[PDB]
Design a protein around this nucleic acid. Structure first.
Ligand SMILES: [Zn+2]
Ligand SMILES: [Zn+2]
Ligand SMILES: [Zn+2]
Lengths: 79, 111, 111, 108, 95, 144, 212, 100
RNA sequence: UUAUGUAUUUACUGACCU
């Protein structure tokens, strides 16, 4: 069964479908995990931050992209 | 070959490798196919205990180097200095990642 | 106080590299992206060297780059996706020696 | 361009202003210093002549020890995580020769 | 809660299941419809359906008690048939 | 649940910012971390008041406006005050009469003086750095 | 000499004074922006040019007062008190790892030389007079209109990627004046009230003077 | 628009169909809603340009005459790189005035 | 003396509008 969790959506006031915006009741974990995900897509987005990160290890660029890419699922830790 | 970001093998039998750090290269493909000598293995042969198909690395047999295209990436540290007593100064550059790294001296002239 | 940027020896590290009949002839060409730079390279087959034919500054980061051939077509069009919210399809005009921008469609905010 | 090859990733260098010479620090994460390369190769040879050698080929261990692949060609080995190879090189900026070489320790 | 052990409608028959459901909804609202029996049909067409959406859209027509007991009846028949390779629940295997 | 300003002031590396309401937050430690992060500017002072941020400016009468000096050295203030004062004597008879028979060339000052005042004689004003947010008094505390 | 520029890895440049009578190290100025500085170089006794991980180049000049004599609890905005200020921001697209003030050709002049991470090598060159500054500003302001970049990425909003651009003219857009068809060149040059060989002369004079 | 705060935009993906403005609203920007500095054409989605709705005004829904544009101040804020700016609902103005 | 709830004018805003 279930009880009373019927909340499909409501008045389309602004449609903040941009993920990562956040509202008043947004906790520390939520906007820090959006902060880490935006950081990761900007790391692999720019070529040259990915250069800078690949020089610091000896790892190749696809190794660094696969590491950064698999960390985007749960980067900060469990809620 | 050194590790590449992208490869473009060419009809007319070339192989272009773009090393992400250091120099890029263009090879002529000498023995394509290469179905003669080497211990090749496959997918559906019943090999167990992990990988179990190894290979001994070796120097070039299938490619011959033709062109070394030059690059300074990654310029890690640099100096403008006039150490070689020439009139114009010189660029003393650190470059490369790993065992392919190099110090590179740059002048204004021609080869 | 009031400055002026100039590139002396523009960028040489290659992030993406694609190949195809961009000129529209039987021979093939490489199009590479130096990140901020977009360059066309001809692999001169008889002498084996590599000659740059064109180098433009796209003033973006070429996040991805891929060439495609139209169905029943001779020339390949380059296709660039960047930090702008724009797909942009390019054609190498060999006559005027420049990349003619064929189309440019906007789909989202930039960066 | 004229290149003087190096072992690792060169972080920065200074210039001895008297009698102009470059003093370079080379440093790479995930890399063995070559004392550990020699010890790791000797260890490899040891377990290859220990793992059931009764039936035999200790030729394999010796041939493994004395056939050194060029790491600029075949890629340097990568020392797991947290290991750190590093050397210090005094170099002539004219000819580009290793006028002095000082290794460091394994993680230093 | 118990409605969340997932289902795959490829594992189940459906033409044997319909007359039981018709008989149950004739018991629940007294009389016969089609559009809610065809709701059962058309909601259980999709291969991996959802039970919570099922419970909402039957809570609408029915009481909200009868939707609760109806899901607590109908979902274990689906599980008891999808365990079996035959595709038949225990109330129609034994009888 | 809401551990008070004592312990919350004891835990934080910069305790000099934790206030009487920060205990009543929904995440106190990051609030007083971001309150003690480096170059932020704080919430305005009137978030807790009852006076709608400037309805305390009631009875004080203030001067109209000081023009900057490069504009005052064009004589536009004297010409404009002179014709305003001359226009305060007109009736609707002459305000409707000189609507249809207009005397012109009332100001006609010049164009080179105005160009020089905005281009030759331009004065940098006294700006402020990005921290110096505004509260209600703020110019009557000139005592610093 | 008598001043220290400490580059934080995250915030910015922090001016420190070292005393002779005492041995103290007194922070007396910092900058308001977080920057992630990678390398830096001194240009004047006041100014510090630095570069960051993301690609920009900042030049932070101290205000004209900033008296060093501070002997040692409140800060100004959780930091130092004499907030230094920024007199250019510019985006390069690559991480600049070496900034150096030098003169590449004898008979030439000083020019800041940056060597990025992706192999590129550039210079930042001061302007002599306001006629040169205003000319090249109108040149590149015309080229943002007539000659848009290839990806559609807006050139003012590429150079103002992280921080807004300030007092730097992108001469790599300017040196694409020599790459348009001469209809566009005549449009720009008569919009400049010059001729296209005159503009190409005036445009390669700067690279001739300061650099290669 | 900015004047009528209850008007809602369409905001779906912008296709290739160029927006149009009526004769009563020529020169208006669509978002900032002013007259000067038009810089960027309007691309409207395919649902808000289908059949009967072709060449119709973006704002008024009257018969379009000229092409629609964004300001420079909408362009450099990238208010053109959101959805299609086709004002969908007609609410509480030009309805009661029709009943008056 | 900050202040509410309302009956209630007067002013003011949005290049609002046939
Ligand atoms: Zn607008
Ligand atoms: Zn639409
Ligand atoms: Zn209209």
């Amino acid at each position: 069964m279930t009880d009373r969790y019927t909340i499909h959506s409501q008045l389309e006031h602004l449609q903040s479908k941009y993920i990562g915006t956040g509202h008043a009741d947004t906790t520390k974990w939520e906007w820090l995990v959006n902060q880490h995900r935006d950081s990761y897509c900007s790391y692999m987005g720019h070529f040259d931050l990915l250069n800078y990160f690949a020089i610091a290890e000896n790892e190749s660029k696809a190794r660094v992209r696969f590491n950064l890419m698999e960390k985007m699922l749960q980067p900060c830790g469990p809620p | 070959v050194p590790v590449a970001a992208a490869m473009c093998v060419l009809k007319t039998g070339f192989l272009f490798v773009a090393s992400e750090f250091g120099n890029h290269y263009l090879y002529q493909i000498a023995h394509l196919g290469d179905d003669d000598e080497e211990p090749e293995f496959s997918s559906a042969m019943p090999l167990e205990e992990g990988d179990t198909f190894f290979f001994q690395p070796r120097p070039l047999k299938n490619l011959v180097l033709v062109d070394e295209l030059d690059s300074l990436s990654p310029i890690l540290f640099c100096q403008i200095a006039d150490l070689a007593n020439e009139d114009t100064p010189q660029l003393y550059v650190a470059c490369g990642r790993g065992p392919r790294s190099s110090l590179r001296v740059l002048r204004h002239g021609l080869e | 106080m009031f400055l002026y940027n100039l590139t002396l020896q523009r960028a040489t590290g290659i992030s993406f590299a694609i190949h195809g009949n961009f000129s529209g002839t039987k021979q093939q060409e490489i199009v590479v992206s130096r990140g901020k730079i977009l360059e066309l390279l001809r692999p001169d087959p008889n002498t084996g060297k590599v000659h740059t034919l064109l180098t433009v500054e796209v003033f973006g980061v070429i996040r991805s780059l891929m060439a495609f051939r139209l169905t029943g077509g001779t020339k390949d069009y380059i296709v660039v996706g960047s930090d702008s919210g724009r797909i942009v399809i390019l054609e190498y005009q060999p006559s005027k020696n420049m990349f003619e921008k064929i189309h440019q469609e906007t789909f989202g905010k930039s960066g | 361009q004229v290149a003087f090859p190096l072992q690792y990733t060169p972080r920065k260098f200074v210039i001895h202003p008297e009698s102009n010479n470059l003093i370079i620090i080379e440093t790479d994460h995930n890399a063995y210093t070559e004392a550990t390369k020699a010890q790791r190769k000797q260890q490899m040879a040891e377990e290859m002549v220990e793992a059931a050698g009764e039936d035999l080929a200790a030729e394999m261990a010796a041939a493994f020890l004395n056939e050194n692949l060029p790491e600029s060609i075949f890629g340097a080995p990568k020392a797991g995580n947290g290991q750190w190879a590093s050397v210090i090189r005094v170099m002539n900026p004219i000819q580009g020769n290793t006028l002095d070489l000082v290794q460091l320790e394994q993680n230093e | 809660e118990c409605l969340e052990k997932k289902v795959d409608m490829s594992k189940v028959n459906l033409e044997v299941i319909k007359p039981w459901i018709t008989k149950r909804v004739t018991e629940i609202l007294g009389f016969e419809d089609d559009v809610v029996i065809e709701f059962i049909f058309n909601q259980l067409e999709v291969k991996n359906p959802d039970s919570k959406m099922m419970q909402i859209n039957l809570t609408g027509f029915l009481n909200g008690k009868n939707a609760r007991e109806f899901m607590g009846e109908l979902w274990p028949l689906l599980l008891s048939a999808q365990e079996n390779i035959a595709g038949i629940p225990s109330a129609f295997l034994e009888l | 649940n809401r551990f008070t300003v004592a312990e919350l002031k004891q835990l934080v590396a910069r305790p000099d910012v934790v206030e009487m309401h920060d205990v009543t937050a929904q995440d106190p430690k990051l609030l007083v971390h971001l309150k003690a992060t480096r170059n932020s500017v704080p919430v305005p002072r009137h978030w807790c008041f009852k006076r709608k941020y400037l309805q305390g400016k009631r009875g004080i009468e203030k001067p109209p406006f000081e023009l900057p000096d490069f504009i005052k050295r064009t004589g536009i203030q004297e010409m404009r005050e002179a014709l305003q004062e001359k226009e305060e004597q007109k009736t609707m008879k002459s305000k409707m009469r000189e609507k249809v028979r207009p005397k012109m060339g009332k100001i006609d000052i010049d164009y080179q003086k105005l160009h020089d005042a905005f281009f030759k004689w331009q004065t940098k004003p006294k700006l402020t750095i990005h921290g110096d947010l505004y509260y209600e008094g703020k110019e009557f505390e000139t005592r610093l | 000499g008598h001043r220290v520029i400490v580059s934080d890895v995250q915030e910015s440049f922090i001016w420190v004074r070292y005393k002779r009578n005492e041995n103290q190290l007194i922070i007396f100025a910092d900058d308001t922006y977080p920057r992630w500085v990678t390398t830096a170089s001194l240009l004047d006794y006041d100014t510090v040019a630095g570069a960051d991980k993301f690609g920009n180049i900042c030049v932070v000049r101290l205000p004209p007062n900033t008296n060093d004599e501070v002997d040692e609890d409140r800060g100004l905005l959780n930091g130092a008190s004499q907030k230094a200020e920024v007199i250019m921001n510019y985006h390069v697209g690559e991480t600049v790892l070496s900034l150096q003030k030098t003169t590449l050709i004898p008979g030439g002049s000083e020019s800041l030389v940056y060597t990025t991470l992706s192999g590129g090598i550039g210079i930042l060159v001061p302007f002599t007079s306001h006629e040169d500054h205003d000319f090249f500003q109108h040149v590149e302001m015309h080229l943002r209109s007539e000659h848009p970049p290839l990806c559609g990425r807006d050139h003012l909003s590429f150079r103002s990627y992280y921080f807004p651009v300030k007092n730097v003219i992108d001469g790599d857009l300017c040196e694409q004046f020599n790459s348009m068809e001469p209809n566009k060149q005549k449009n720009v040059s008569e919009e400049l009230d010059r001729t296209p060989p005159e503009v190409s002369k005036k445009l390669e004079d700067i690279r001739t003077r300061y650099a290669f | 628009a900015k004047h009528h705060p209850d008007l809602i935009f369409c905001r779906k993906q912008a296709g290739v169909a160029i927006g149009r403005l009526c004769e009563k609203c020529d020169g208006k920007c669509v978002i900032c809603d002013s007259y000067v500095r038009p810089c960027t054409l309007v691309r409207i989605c395919d649902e808000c340009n289908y059949g009967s709705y072709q060449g119709r005004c973006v704002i008024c829904g009257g018969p379009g005459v000229s092409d629609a544009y964004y300001c420079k101040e909408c362009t450099i804020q990238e208010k053109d790189r959101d959805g299609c700016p086709k004002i969908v609902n007609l609410g509480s103005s030009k309805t009661d005035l029709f009943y008056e």
